[PDB]
Coordinates of N, CA and C and ligand atoms in Angstrom, one line a residue:
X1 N 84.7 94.0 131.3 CA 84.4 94.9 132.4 C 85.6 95.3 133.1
X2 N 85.6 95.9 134.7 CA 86.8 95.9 135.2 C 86.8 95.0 136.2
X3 N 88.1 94.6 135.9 CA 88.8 93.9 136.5 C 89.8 94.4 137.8
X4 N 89.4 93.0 138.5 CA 89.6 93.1 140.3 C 91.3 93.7 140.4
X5 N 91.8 93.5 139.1 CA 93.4 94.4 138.3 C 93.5 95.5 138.7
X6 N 92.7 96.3 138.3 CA 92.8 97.5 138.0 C 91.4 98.8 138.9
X7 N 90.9 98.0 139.4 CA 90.2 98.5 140.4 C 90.3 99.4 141.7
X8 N 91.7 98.7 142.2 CA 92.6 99.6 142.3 C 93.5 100.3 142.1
X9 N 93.5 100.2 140.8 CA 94.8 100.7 140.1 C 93.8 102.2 139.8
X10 N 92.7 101.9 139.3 CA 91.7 103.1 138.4 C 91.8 104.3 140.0
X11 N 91.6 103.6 141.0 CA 91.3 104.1 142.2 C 92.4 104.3 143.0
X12 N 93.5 103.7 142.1 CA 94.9 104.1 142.9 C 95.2 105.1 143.0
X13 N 95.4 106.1 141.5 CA 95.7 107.1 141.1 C 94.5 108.6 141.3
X14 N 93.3 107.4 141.7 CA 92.5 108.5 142.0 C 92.2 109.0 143.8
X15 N 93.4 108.0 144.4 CA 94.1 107.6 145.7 C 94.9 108.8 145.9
X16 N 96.0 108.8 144.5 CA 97.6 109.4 144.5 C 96.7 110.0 143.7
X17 N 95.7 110.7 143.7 CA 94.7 111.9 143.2 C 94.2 112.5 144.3
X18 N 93.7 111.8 145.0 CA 93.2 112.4 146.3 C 94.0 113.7 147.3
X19 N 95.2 113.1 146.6 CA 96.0 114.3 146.8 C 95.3 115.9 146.3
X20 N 95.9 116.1 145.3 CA 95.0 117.3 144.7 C 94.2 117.4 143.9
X21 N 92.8 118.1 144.4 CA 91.8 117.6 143.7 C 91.7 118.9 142.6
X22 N 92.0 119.8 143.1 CA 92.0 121.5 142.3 C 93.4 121.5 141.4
X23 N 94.1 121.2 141.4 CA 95.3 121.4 140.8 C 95.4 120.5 139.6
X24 N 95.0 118.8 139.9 CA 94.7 118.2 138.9 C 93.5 118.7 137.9
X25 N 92.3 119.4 138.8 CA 91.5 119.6 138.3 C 91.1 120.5 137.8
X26 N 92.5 121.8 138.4 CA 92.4 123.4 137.5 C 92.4 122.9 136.0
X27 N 92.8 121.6 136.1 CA 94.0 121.1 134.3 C 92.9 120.6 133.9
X28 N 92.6 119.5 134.2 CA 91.2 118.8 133.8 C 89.8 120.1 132.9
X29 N 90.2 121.2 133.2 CA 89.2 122.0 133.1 C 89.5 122.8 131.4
X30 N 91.0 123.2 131.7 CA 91.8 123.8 130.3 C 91.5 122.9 129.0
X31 N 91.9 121.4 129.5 CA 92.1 120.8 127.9 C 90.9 120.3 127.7
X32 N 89.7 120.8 128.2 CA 88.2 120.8 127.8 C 88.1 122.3 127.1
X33 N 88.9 123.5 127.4 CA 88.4 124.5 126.6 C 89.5 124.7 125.4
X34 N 91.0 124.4 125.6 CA 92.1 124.6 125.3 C 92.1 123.9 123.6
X35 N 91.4 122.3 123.7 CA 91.1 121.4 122.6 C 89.7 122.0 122.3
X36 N 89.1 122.4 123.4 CA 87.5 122.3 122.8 C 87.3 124.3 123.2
X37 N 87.3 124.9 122.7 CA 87.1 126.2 123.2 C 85.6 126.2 123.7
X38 N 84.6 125.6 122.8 CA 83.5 125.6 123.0 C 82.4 125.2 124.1
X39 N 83.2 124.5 124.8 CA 82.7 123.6 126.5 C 82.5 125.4 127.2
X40 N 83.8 126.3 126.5 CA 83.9 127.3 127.5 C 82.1 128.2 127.8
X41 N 81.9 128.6 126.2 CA 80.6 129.2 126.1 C 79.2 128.3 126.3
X42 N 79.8 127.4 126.7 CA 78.6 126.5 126.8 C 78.6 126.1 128.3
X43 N 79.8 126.7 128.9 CA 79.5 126.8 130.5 C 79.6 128.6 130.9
X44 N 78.5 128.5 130.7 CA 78.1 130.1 130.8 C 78.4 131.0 132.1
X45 N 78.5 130.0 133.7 CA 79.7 130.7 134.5 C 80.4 131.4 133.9
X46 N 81.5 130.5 133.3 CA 82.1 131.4 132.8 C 82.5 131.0 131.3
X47 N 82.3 132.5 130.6 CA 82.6 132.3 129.2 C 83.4 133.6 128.9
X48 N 83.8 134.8 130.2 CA 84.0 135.8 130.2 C 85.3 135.3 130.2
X49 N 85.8 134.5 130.9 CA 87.3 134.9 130.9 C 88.2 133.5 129.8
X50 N 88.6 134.7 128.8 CA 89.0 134.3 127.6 C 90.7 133.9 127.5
X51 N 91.7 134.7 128.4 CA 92.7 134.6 128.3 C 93.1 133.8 129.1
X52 N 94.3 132.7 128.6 CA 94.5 131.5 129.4 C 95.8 131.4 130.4
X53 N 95.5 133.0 131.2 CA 97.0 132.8 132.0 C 95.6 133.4 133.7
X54 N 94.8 133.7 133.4 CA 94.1 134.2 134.4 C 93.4 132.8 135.0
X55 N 93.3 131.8 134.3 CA 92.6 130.7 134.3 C 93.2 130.3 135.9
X56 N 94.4 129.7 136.2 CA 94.9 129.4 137.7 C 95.1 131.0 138.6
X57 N 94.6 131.9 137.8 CA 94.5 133.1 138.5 C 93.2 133.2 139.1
X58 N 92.2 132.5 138.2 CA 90.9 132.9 139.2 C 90.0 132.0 140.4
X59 N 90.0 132.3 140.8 CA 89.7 131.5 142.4 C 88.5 130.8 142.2
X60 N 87.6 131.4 141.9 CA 86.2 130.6 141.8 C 86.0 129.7 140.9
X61 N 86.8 129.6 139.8 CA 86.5 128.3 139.1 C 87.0 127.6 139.2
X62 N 87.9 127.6 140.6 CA 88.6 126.5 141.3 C 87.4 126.2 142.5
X63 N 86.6 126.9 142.8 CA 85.4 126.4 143.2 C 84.9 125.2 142.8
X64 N 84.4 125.0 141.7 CA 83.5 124.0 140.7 C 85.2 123.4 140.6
X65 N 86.3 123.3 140.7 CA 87.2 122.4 140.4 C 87.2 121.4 141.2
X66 N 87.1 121.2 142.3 CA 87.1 120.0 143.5 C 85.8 119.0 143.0
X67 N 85.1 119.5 142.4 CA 83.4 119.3 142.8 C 83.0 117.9 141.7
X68 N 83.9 118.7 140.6 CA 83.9 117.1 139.3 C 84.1 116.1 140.0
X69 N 85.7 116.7 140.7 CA 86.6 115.4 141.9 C 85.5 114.9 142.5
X70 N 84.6 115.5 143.5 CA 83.9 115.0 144.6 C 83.1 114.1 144.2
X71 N 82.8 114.6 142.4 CA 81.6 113.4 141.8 C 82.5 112.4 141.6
X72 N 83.6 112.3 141.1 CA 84.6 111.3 140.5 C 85.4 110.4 142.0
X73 N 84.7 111.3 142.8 CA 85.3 111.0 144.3 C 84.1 110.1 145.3
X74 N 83.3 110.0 144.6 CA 81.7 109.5 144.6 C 81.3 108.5 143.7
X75 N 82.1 108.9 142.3 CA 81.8 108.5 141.6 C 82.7 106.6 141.5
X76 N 83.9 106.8 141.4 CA 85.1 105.8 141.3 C 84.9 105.8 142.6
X77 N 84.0 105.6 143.4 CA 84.4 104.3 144.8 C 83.5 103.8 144.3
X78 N 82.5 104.0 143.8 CA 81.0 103.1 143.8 C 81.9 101.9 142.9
X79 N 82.6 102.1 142.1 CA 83.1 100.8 141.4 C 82.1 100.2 140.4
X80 N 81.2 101.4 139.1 CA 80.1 100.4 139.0 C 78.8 100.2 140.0
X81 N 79.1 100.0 141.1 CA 78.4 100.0 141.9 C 77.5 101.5 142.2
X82 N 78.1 102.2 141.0 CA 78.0 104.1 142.0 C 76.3 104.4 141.4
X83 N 75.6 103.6 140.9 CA 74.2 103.9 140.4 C 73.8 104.7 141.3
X84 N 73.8 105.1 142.1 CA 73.7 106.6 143.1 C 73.6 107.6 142.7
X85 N 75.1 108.0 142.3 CA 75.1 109.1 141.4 C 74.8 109.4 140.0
X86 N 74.8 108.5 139.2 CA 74.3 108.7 137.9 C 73.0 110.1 137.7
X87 N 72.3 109.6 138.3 CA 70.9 110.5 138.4 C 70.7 112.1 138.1
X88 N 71.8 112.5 139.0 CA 71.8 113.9 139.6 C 72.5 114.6 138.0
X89 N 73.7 113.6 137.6 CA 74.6 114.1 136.5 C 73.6 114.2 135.2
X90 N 72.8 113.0 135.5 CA 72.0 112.5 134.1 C 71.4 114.0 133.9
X91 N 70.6 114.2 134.9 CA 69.5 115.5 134.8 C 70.0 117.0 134.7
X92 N 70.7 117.3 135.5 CA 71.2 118.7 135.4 C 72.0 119.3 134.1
X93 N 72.8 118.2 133.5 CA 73.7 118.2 132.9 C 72.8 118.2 131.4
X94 N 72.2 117.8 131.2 CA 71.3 117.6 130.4 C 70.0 118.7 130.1
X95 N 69.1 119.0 131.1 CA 68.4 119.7 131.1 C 68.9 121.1 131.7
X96 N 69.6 121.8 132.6 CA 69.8 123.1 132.9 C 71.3 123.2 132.0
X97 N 72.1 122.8 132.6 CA 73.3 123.0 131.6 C 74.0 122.4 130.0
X98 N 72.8 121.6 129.4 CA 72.5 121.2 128.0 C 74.1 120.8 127.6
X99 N 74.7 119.6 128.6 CA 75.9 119.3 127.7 C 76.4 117.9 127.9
X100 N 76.2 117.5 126.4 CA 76.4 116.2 126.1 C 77.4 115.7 126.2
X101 N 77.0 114.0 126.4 CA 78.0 113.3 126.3 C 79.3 113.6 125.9
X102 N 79.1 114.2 124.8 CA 80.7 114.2 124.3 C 81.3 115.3 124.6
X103 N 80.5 116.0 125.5 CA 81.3 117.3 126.0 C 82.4 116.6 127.5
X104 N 81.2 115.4 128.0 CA 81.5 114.9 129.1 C 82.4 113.7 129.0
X105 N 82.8 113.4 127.6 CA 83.4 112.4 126.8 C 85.2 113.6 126.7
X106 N 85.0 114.5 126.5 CA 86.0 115.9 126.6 C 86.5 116.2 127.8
X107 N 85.4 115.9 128.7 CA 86.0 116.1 129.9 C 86.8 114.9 130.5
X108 N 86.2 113.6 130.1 CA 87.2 112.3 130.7 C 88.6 112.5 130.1
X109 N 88.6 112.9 128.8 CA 89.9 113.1 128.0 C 90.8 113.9 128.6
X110 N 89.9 114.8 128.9 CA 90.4 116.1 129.7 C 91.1 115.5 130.3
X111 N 90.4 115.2 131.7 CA 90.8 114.1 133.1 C 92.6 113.5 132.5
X112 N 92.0 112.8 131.7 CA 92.5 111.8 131.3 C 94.2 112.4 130.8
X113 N 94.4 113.3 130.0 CA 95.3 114.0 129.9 C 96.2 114.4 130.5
X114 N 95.2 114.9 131.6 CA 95.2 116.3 132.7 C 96.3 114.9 134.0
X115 N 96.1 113.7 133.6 CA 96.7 113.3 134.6 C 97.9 112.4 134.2
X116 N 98.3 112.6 133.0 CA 99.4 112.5 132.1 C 100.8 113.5 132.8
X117 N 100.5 115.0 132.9 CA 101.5 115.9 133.3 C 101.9 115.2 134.7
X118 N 100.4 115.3 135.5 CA 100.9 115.5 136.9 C 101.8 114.3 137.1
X119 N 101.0 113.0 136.6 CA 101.3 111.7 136.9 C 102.0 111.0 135.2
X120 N 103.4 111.0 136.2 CA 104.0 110.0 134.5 C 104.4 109.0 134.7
X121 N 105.4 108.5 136.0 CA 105.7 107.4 136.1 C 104.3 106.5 136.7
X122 N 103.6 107.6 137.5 CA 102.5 106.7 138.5 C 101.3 106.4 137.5
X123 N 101.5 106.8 135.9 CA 100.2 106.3 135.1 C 101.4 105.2 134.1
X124 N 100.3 104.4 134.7 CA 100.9 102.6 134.0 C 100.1 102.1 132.6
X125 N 100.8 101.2 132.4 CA 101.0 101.1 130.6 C 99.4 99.9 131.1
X126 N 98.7 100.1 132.0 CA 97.8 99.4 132.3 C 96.7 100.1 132.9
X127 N 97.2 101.6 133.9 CA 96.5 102.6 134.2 C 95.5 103.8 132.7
X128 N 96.3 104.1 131.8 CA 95.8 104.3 131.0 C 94.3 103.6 130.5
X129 N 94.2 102.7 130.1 CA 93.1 102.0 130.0 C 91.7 102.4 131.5
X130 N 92.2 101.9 132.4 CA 91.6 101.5 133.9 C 90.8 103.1 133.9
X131 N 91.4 104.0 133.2 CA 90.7 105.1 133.3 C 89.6 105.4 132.3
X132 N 90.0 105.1 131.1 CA 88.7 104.7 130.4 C 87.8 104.0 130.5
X133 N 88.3 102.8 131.0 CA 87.0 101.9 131.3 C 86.2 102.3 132.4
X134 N 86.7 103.3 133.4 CA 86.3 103.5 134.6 C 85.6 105.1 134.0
X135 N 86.2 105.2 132.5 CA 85.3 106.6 132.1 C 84.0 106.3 131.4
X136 N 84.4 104.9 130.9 CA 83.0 104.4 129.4 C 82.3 104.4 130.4
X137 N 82.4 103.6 131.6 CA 81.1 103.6 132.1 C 80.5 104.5 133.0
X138 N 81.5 105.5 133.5 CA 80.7 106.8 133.8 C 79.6 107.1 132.2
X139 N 80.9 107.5 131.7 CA 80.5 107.8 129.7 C 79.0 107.3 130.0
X140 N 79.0 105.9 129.9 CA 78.3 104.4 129.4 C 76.8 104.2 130.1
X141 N 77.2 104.5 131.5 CA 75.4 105.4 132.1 C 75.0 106.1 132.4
X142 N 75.6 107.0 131.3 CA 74.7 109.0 131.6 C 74.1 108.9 129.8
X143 N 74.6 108.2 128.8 CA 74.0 108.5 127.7 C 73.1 107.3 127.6
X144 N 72.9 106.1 128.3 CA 71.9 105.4 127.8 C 70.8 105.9 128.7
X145 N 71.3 106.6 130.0 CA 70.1 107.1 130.5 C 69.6 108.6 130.1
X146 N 70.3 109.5 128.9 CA 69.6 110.3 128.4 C 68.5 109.7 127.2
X147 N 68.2 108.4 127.4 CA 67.1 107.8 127.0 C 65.7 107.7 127.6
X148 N 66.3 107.7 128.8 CA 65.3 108.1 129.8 C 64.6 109.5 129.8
X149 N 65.6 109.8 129.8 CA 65.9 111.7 129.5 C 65.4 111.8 128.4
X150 N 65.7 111.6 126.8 CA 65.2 112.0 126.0 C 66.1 113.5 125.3
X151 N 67.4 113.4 126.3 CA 67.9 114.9 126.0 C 69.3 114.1 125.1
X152 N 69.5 112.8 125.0 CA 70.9 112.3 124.1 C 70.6 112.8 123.1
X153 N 72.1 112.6 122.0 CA 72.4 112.9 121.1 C 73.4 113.9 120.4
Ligands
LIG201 C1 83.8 115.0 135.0 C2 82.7 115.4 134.3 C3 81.5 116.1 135.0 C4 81.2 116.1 136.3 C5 81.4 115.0 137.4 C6 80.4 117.3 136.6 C7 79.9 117.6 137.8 C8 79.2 118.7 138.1 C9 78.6 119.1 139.4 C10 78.7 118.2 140.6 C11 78.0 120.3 139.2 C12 77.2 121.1 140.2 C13 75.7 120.8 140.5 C14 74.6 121.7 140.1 O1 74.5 122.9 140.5 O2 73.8 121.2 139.3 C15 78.2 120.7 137.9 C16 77.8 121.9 137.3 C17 78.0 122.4 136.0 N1 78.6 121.7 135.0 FE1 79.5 119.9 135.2 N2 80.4 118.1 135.4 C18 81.0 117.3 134.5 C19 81.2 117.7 133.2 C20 80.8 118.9 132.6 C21 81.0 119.3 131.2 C22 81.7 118.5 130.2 C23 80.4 120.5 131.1 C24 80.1 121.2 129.8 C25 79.7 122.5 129.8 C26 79.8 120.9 132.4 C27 79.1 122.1 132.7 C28 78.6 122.4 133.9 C29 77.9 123.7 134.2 C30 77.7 124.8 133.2 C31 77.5 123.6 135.5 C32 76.8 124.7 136.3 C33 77.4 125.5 137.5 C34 76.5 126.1 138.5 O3 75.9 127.2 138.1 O4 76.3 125.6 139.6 N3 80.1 119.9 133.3 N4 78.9 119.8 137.2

């Protein structure tokens, strides 16, 4: 599980994250379409804008950029403890915007990437990890609860 280690450490960076939530998160957004083009058409906001230099050009999908943060900002204090939020992500995400796990498994990667550039000396040969495990189990209770749902797979 996580350990009382890296609990802060997962929440450190999401600390020395708190810094920018749009900027880490303009990026978090790219190497979900950049690797995955397909997240793009499957987030039907926007699927219009194709070319990848307008992307920090356009203002509104830095709208929905803080908002991941706010769940992840919601989400990484619960510690585990965040069974709060699961619910909202389970259903919407699933039922009105029909995107799986592994799109949301794309987006941790994303994250996860995305906080490679900003952060290089401040991501530790121990931080790496703390973010996956702090992602399996975002990951880890949205797909056992599309059981509930009925929309996994
Ligand atoms: C860090 C991962 C994720 C988090 C925390 C997250 C969070 C959110 C939140 C808080 C909303 C707005 C609430 C609403 O109106 O229902 C939203 C909307 C949306 N998300 Fe995500 N999301 C994540 C991953 C993804 C992925 C991987 C996709 C794949 C397409 C996606 C697609 C969408 C779409 C299409 C909307 C609808 C926007 C609207 O019209 O309001 N999300 N997400």
């Amino acid at each position: 599980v996580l350990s009382e280690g890296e609990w802060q450490l997962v929440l450190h960076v999401w600390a020395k994250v708190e810094a920018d939530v749009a900027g880490h998160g303009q990026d978090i957004l790219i190497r979900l379409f950049k690797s995955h083009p397909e997240t793009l058409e499957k987030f039907d906001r926007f699927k219009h804008l194709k070319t990848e230099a307008e992307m920090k050009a356009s203002e509104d999908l830095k709208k929905h950029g803080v908002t991941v943060l706010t769940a992840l900002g919601a989400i990484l204090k619960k510690k585990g403890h965040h069974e709060a939020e699961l619910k909202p992500l389970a259903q919407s995400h699933a039922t009105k915007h029909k995107i799986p796990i592994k799109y949301l498994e794309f987006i941790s990667e994303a994250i996860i990437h995305v906080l490679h550039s900003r952060h290089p000396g401040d991501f530790g040969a121990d931080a790496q990890g703390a973010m996956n495990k702090a992602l399996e189990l975002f990951r880890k209770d949205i797909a056992a609860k599309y059981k509930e749902l009925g929309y996994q797979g």
